[PDB]
Paper text:
The FDA approved nivolumab for the treatment of melanoma in December 2014, NSCLC in March 2015, renal cell carcinoma in November 2015, and Hodgkin lymphoma in May 2016. The PD-1/nivolumab Fab complex and free nivolumab Fab fragment were crystallized and their structures were determined and refined to a resolution of 3.3 and 1.9 Å, respectively. The structural comparisons of the Fv regions of pembrolizumab and nivolumab before and after binding to PD-1 show little deviation in the conformation of the CDRs and minor adjustments in the side chains involved in the interaction with PD-1, implying that these antibody drugs maintain the CDR loops in productive binding conformations prior to interaction with PD-1.
Author numbering:
A (entry chain H): 2 to 209
B (entry chain L): 1 to 211
Write the structure that this text describes.
Amino acid sequence: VQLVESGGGVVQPGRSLRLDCKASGITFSNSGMHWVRQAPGKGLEWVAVIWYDGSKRYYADSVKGRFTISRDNSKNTLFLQMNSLRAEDTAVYYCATNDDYWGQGTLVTVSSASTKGPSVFPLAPSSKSTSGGTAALGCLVKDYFPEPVTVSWNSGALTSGVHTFPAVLQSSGLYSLSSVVTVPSSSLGTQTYICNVNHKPSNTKVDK
Amino acid sequence: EIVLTQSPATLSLSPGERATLSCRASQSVSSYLAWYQQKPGQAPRLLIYDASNRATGIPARFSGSGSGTDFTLTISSLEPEDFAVYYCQQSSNWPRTFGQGTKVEIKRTVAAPSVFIFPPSDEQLKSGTASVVCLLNNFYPREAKVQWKVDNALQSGNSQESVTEQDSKDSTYSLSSTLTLSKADYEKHKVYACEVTHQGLSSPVTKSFNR
């Protein structure tokens, strides 16, 4: 059972956007479907529902006359067609079956401001000769807009000991964060460590 | 619409403790009330439906009770992995409505930070700015004091902090402090130090580097 969403991205206010949710492993034609959204740092809010056969739809007041929920049962796909977007509409949008299988979410960011890709800088200790058996490495991801950036290490082969900090908003109006990882000092010189930085809004991918 | 009020807003308990979360509806929703768990960076997950039925694959320590306007979600013995925000949702009528959530935080024992300091790199300094980073790793509680010293001169207004969410396995936090200065000011000085005080330390810990 899988619900896979797509369609999210950065969009300027006033514009339209269509979100898709494709289902696998369920009798989709027999399931009611919902959209639910969640602003950053906030709670869950129901957006709309559509009956299994498409014959009935209901909406949250704040999207009536503006959003349309629909489905293509022959493609096992649920749609949300949005119009006249505002900052208010910035959220992760989830699809959910009526019996509560949920998709992974897709982020919609509504912003007039120009997007900017990050500068990426290594964080390494000042030598190689640590004072202990554990070392920390990292990358500074600096001056980007808008959120988010995602970071992996060694293409996701390195996960244990990884901490990626919540972004901080600068006086610049831009964002900065860092990602760090702790590793054995003995591996310094043996093992290559690469951070994989991804900032989809500016089509930027960097690997220091 | 049917208003759902959850309490308390935040609940902070040790692993093994019993946790009791409340949801109150402004009018009867009969038993059309579900509970969800949402861990950091994840979609919500159904725990309990129809007030008291455990969903598929949900551990036995989760249970629910109530009908009409008063509802309870119980975690009979809390685990570190239960760090999450918990929501109730009514499906008695339209629009569907959610409570505002209860954040369940894990009260573990005191753990001192491992501290690391990073000089500004190569490239960054080509642009006219210097960022020196102090890392405090895997500690508890969240409160920590970080002081920057350049030549034993305490710094102010030139640093920003960021703190992770509680770790799902060990319930600790990590924190970064970034001192940001102009490249040309990062050479009027030699000694850069981060000094840390925390409940887990018996004495302040200082990490430093020269030039």
